[PDB]
Design an enzyme around this catalytic site. Structure first.
Site, PDB file in Angstrom:
ATOM      1  N   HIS A  60       0.835  -1.203   0.000  1.00 58.30           N
ATOM      2  CA  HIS A  60       0.000   0.000   0.000  1.00 58.30           C
ATOM      3  C   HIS A  60       0.868   1.250   0.000  1.00 58.30           C
ATOM      4  CE1 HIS A  60      -3.528   2.508   0.425  1.00 58.30           C
ATOM      5  NE2 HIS A  60      -3.033   3.061   1.516  1.00 58.30           N
ATOM      6  N   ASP A 174      -8.052   1.353   1.696  1.00 56.45           N
ATOM      7  CA  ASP A 174      -7.730   2.386   2.679  1.00 56.45           C
ATOM      8  C   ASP A 174      -8.627   3.641   2.781  1.00 56.45           C
ATOM      9  OD1 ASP A 174      -4.800   4.007   4.025  1.00 56.45           O
ATOM     10  OD2 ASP A 174      -6.119   2.583   4.982  1.00 56.45           O
ATOM     11  N   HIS A 441      -6.695   9.526  -0.839  1.00 55.21           N
ATOM     12  CA  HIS A 441      -7.325   9.470   0.484  1.00 55.21           C
ATOM     13  C   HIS A 441      -6.502  10.107   1.662  1.00 55.21           C
ATOM     14  CE1 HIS A 441      -5.172   5.628  -0.085  1.00 55.21           C
ATOM     15  NE2 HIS A 441      -4.905   5.749   1.203  1.00 55.21           N
TER      16      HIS A 441
HETATM   17  O1  LIG Z   1      -5.005   5.271   9.473  1.00 58.15           O
HETATM   18  C1  LIG Z   1      -5.367   6.027   8.345  1.00 58.15           C
HETATM   19  C2  LIG Z   1      -4.360   5.722   7.262  1.00 58.15           C
HETATM   20  O2  LIG Z   1      -4.537   4.425   6.849  1.00 58.15           O
HETATM   21  C3  LIG Z   1      -3.371   3.896   6.317  1.00 58.15           C
HETATM   22  O3  LIG Z   1      -2.325   3.379   7.173  1.00 58.15           O
HETATM   23  C4  LIG Z   1      -2.643   4.875   5.381  1.00 58.15           C
HETATM   24  O4  LIG Z   1      -1.863   4.192   4.377  1.00 58.15           O
HETATM   25  C5  LIG Z   1      -3.101   6.217   5.198  1.00 58.15           C
HETATM   26  O5  LIG Z   1      -3.310   6.749   3.915  1.00 58.15           O
HETATM   27  C6  LIG Z   1      -4.322   6.602   6.034  1.00 58.15           C
HETATM   28  O6  LIG Z   1      -4.258   7.954   6.386  1.00 58.15           O
HETATM   29 ZN   LIG Z   2      -3.373   4.900   2.430  1.00 56.54          ZN
END
Ligand SMILES: OC[C@H]1O[C@H](O)[C@@H](O)[C@@H](O)[C@@H]1O
Ligand SMILES: [Zn+2]
Ligand SMILES: *[C@@H]1O[C@@H](CO)[C@@H](O)[C@H](O)[C@H]1NC(C)=O
Length: 1015
Positions: A60, A174, A441
């Site tokens: 991710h 996510d 996001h």
């Molecule tokens: O906890 C929120 C968070 O989720 C994931 O760990 C991420 O990769 C972020 O983009 C997001 O802000």
């Molecule tokens: Zn993310």
């Protein structure tokens, strides 16, 4: 056409209905903390019916969050992709999925030709697979559907050209809650499957118990089911390895082979992974297969998805090897042990879905239908993620401004082919990419680190400049006699003039048109109308004299109004917020009338004295203890008075009454009608003094909001023939109610200053009998019915307001339209509220590692529409959707897609023409040309122009339809040779159109068309 109003779809799961029945109890479920102890029958799988397991490696990658896009690319992502290339090349059985094309394009572009060929080969052979293939994995709450489509198209267009592939499976792991806008766009873009993760833990528990985690997701108004998209919801708390093998993270963490020490990672459950060997493989397989079979109980087929990854995983060489080698030892043992009745392998997402549907087609499984959304997300307890509906509202507003500028730039330049020297394509691509990136996001959500927020802003500012350049070059070309037209493609023929961005009091960016009998008697201005119907709108310009009149290009007088330029100052000396009037510039306001998708030229001319067709606004300053406010040459003297209730009426429109504090009190629709109570009120939410703290993600109020103490604010009343307004300087907000003869415009200059642990909310109080029902939109695409649930905490009843919200009873509706996504609710019958800004001192433990302390002044804009709805044909009580009126829809368009204003930048515009597009069809009011984009460069023998056509659905309330023309987008440009219906990304031809005519689309539908022309 389906009827989107009168037929309530019959679905297995309807999310509003589900919400109304569910208890939401947060009980300890055991090792699966938010579920239950899963049991399975060991005899379910056998030699003739095995569990097929697909382990799907992934990484991710956030295009900005803690670090900027470029920082992550250099530090992490380039190494992940370099290592993916090497490892998949070397190990033919290894698999990997990739989501974020912004990063991939950046990587691929930099690869040498030999490596490009290796990359293409591992894509072609199925080892490396693109999932979604958007520029980003967008936010689904705040994003406009138009920008979701833009970023999707940007990534998939790149993928087609360079990788020769178009993903049909989507992966959204996510985003903080999920929108049905996604399957809507994806199903219309060739998709067959999608996967989501972040949904409320109670919803996961509920759907798991009924094995409804896989469903056919259709739109709330879709009776037939042609919008349906197969969706897989993951069952657990995270997409990380501990929460993806099965219910017990203590066990699952032991199969994340990156957590043994040397990588500086570990298992919080205190049991480490151990290297698989011939001596432990049996006991390790016992444990792992038991997790898999537990996970499998939650779904309906013998095909199981096992995601394998986490944030910025698969970075190191040694990481790839440790994951691959240990998993392959497990697969060899498991697959060769008949008693497990399992066949496990590495797989891609498409492989998983293909196998699921094969099972389906063999009568093995039938899937439930579902409609609704997955807001508002909670990952645990009362931790509801409604904060990000508002966080960094400056940039949320900026998103909508850039949204429109990109559309206007693409549309204006699409009319012509451009030489490569003009750098039109170059500037458009840059703007599309920067806007696309912000859809991430952690972009529009306002959940990135301060320096990352600054990066997104910088990127967006450059995009804005790019759009301005393209727009003004296009205007110059479209309105100059062709034989006179002499472009210097680096020259600024026009400067854009934007009244609402960054906004008065946010930045002094607007140029004054400088006229004088000794310098320049007149100035040409041009308005653009991106909407496919004739439009009138008031426009304003700054001028160096109040004695200015307006004509069109036939030299016909246009009625204009001149008002002072008022700016508000928090005076640190007097400790008041009070207005000062400019003595050197003035606002001239007039009604522009502009063709569908067209342009209209006007002239502003100076005179010595008051012109015949220009009027002057009176001004009234209400305040105890006034001082003079001189206005230079302005012909009318400012009046003064003690604070008092006022009443205003522009044109034939509503009469609005205001309190002595300058806030709306009532709306009277007509001469005779009641003064309907509608009160604006500003309140504040705080933060909890113990327990969980609000941050960039979480809204955790310390109880209901308390009124802002207003003191005795200064109220400025401006009264004109064309425009009147009431402005008041409140603590943290200059609140402005503007009247032009229809629904008022509201503007809030919001400066939360250094008020820590405060969220500022704007509430509307009415006596409308809405009960526990209200409506909010999803991504500017549709309106969904909400029901306030008192069994849930306050923050759970907050929803995204990306573009609008309303309440109604049998007789009356109040609709609030926004020019920016913000969070809001209806916390009591008769109420609407929407958060303005929030400033939070603490982190909320989701990884950001900071509060929100970087607030900056932001001009929020709204339209407020009070209507009678007793005559409207509405959906039944059981229907999950709502619909706008014609007036509310037009109001939304005025905020999101206003006329564009251009000021000619030199003294004389030689060969200027008065109008462009007067022959453009003026299409029915519910239809929009969302996108017009030329898809070919000038060297293409066959030119192609892509159009996205969207029809909303407006309520029938007894207003007879005006005469409108059929819009055929394929005949907007001359010499059409072909008209094709395509996917919304323009990447696939779906239908060859007879007569080269593009049909109009049905209510709520969106179609794309490409017209081909001989050059
Ligand atoms: O906890 C929120 C968070 O989720 C994931 O760990 C991420 O990769 C972020 O983009 C997001 O802000
Ligand atoms: Zn993310
Ligand atoms: C794109 O992929 C294929 C269609 O699925 C091939 O038919 C086509 O040749 C290919 N283009 C290439 C390989 O350059």
């Amino acid at each position: 056409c389906q009827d989107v109003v009168q037929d309530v779809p019959n679905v297995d799961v309807q999310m509003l209905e589900l919400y109304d029945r569910m208890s939401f109890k947060d009980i300890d479920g055991g090792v699966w903390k938010q579920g239950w102890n899963i049991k399975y029958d060991p005899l379910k799988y056998n030699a003739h019916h095995k569990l097929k397991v697909f382990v799907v490696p992934h990484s991710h990658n956030d295009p900005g969050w803690i670090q900027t896009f470029e920082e992550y690319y250099q530090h992490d992502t380039k190494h992940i992709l370099s290592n993916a290339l090497r490892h998949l090349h070397d190990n033919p059985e290894m698999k990997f999925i990739w989501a974020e094309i912004s990063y991939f394009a950046r990587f691929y572009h930099d690869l040498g030709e030999n490596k490009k060929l290796q990359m293409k080969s591992i894509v072609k052979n199925g080892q490396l697979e693109f999932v979604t293939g958007g520029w980003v994995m967008p936010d689904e709450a705040n994003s406009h559907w138009r920008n979701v489509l833009l970023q999707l198209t940007e990534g998939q267009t790149w993928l087609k050209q360079f990788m020769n592939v178009t993903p049909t499976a989507s992966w959204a792991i996510d985003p903080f809650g999920h929108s049905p806008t996604m399957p809507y766009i994806l199903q219309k873009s060739g998709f067959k499957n999608m996967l989501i993760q972040r949904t409320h833990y109670s919803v996961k528990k509920e759907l798991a118990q009924q094995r409804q985690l896989e469903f056919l997701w259709r739109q709330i108004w879709d009776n037939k089911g042609d919008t349906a998209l197969f969706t897989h919801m993951m069952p657990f708390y995270s997409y990380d390895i501990p929460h993806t093998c099965g219910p017990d993270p203590k066990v699952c963490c032991q199969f994340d082979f990156k957590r043994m020490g040397s990588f500086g990672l570990s298992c919080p459950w205190k049991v480490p992974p151990r290297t698989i060997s011939d001596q432990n493989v049996a006991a390790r397989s016992d444990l792992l297969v038991d997790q898999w079979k537990k996970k499998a109980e939650l779904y309906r087929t013998n095909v199981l998805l096992i995601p394998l990854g986490d944030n910025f995983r698969f970075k190191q060489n040694t990481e790839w090897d440790v994951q691959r080698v240990n998993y392959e030892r497990l697969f060899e043992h498991i697959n060769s042990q008949a008693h497990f009745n399992v066949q496990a392998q590495f797989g891609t997402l498409q492989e998983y879905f293909d196998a699921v549907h094969q099972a389906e087609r063999a009568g093995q499984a039938e899937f439930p239908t579902l409609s609704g959304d997955f807001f508002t997300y909670a990952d645990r307890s009362d931790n509801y993620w409604s904060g990000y509906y508002t966080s960094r509202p400056y940039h949320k507003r900026m998103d909508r401004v850039l949204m429109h500028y990109v559309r206007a730039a693409e549309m204006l330049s699409a009319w012509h082919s451009w030489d490569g020297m003009a750098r039109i394509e170059e500037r458009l691509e840059q703007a599309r990419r920067e806007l696309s990136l912000f859809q991430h996001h952690d972009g529009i959500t306002g959940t990135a680190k301060t320096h990352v927020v600054v990066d997104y802003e910088q990127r967006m500012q450059e995009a804005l400049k790019a759009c301005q350049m393209v727009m003004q070059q296009s205007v110059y070309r479209l309105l100059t006699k062709p034989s006179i037209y002499s472009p210097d493609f680096s020259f600024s023929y026009f400067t854009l003039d934007d009244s609402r961005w960054p906004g008065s009091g946010v930045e002094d960016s607007r140029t004054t048109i400088i006229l004088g009998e000794d310098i320049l008697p007149s100035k040409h201005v041009v308005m653009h109308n991106t909407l496919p119907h004739w439009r009138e709108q008031l426009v304003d310009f700054y001028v160096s004299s109040p004695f200015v009149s307006v004509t069109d290009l036939a030299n016909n007088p246009v009625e204009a109004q001149v008002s002072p330029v008022w700016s508000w100052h928090h005076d640190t000396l007097t400790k008041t917020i009070h207005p000062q009037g400019s003595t050197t510039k003035y606002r001239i306001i007039f009604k522009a009338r502009v063709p569908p998708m067209g342009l209209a030229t006007y002239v502003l001319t100076i005179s010595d004295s008051k012109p015949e067709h220009t009027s002057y606004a009176s001004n009234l300053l209400l305040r105890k203890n006034p001082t003079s406010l001189p206005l230079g040459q302005y012909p009318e003297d400012v009046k003064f008075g003690d604070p008092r209730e006022i009443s205003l009426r522009v044109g034939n429109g509503p009469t609005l009454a205001f309190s002595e504090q300058g806030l709306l009190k009532s709306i009277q629709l007509t001469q005779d009608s009641p003064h309907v109570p509608v009160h604006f009120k500003f309140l504040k939410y705080g933060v909890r003094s113990h327990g969980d703290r609000s941050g960039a993600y979480l809204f955790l109020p310390n109880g209901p909001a308390s009124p802002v103490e207003l003191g005795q604010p200064v109220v400025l009343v401006t009264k004109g023939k064309l425009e009147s307004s009431v402005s008041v300087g409140l603590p943290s907000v200059v609140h402005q109610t503007i009247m032009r003869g229809g629904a008022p415009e509201i503007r809030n200059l919001v400066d939360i200053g250094s008020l820590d642990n405060t969220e500022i909310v704007m509430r509307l109080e009415t006596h409308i009998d809405s009960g526990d029902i209200f409506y909010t939109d999803l991504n500017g695409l549709q309106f969904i019915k909400r029901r306030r649930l008192d069994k849930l905490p306050l923050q759970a009843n907050y929803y995204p307001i990306p573009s609008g919200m309303f309440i109604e009873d049998a007789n009356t509706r109040l609709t609030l339209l926004t020019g920016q996504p913000l969070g809001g609710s209806s916390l009591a019958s008769g109420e609407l509220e929407i958060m303005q800004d929030r400033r939070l001192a603490s982190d909320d433990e989701r990884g950001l590692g900071q509060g929100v302390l970087d607030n900056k002044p932001v001009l929020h804009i709204y339209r407020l529409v009070l209507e009678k709805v007793n005559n409207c044909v509405r959906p039944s009580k059981l229907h999950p959707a709502g619909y706008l009126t014609s007036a509310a829809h037009k109001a939304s368009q005025s905020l999101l897609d206003p006329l564009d204003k251009f000021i000619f930048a030199e003294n004389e515009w030689i060969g200027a023409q008065g109008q462009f597009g007067g022959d453009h069809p003026s299409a029915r009011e519910d239809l929009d040309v969302s996108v017009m984009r030329r898809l070919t460069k000038s060297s293409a023998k066959t030119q192609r122009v892509g159009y996205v056509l969207h029809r909303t659905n407006l309520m029938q309330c007894g207003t007879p339809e005006e005469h409108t023309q059929k819009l055929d987008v394929c005949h907007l440009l001359p010499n059409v040779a072909r008209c094709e219906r395509t996917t919304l990304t323009f990447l696939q031809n779906l239908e060859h159109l007879d007569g080269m005519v593009a049909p109009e689309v049905c209510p709520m539908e969106t179609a794309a068309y490409v017209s081909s022309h001989s050059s």
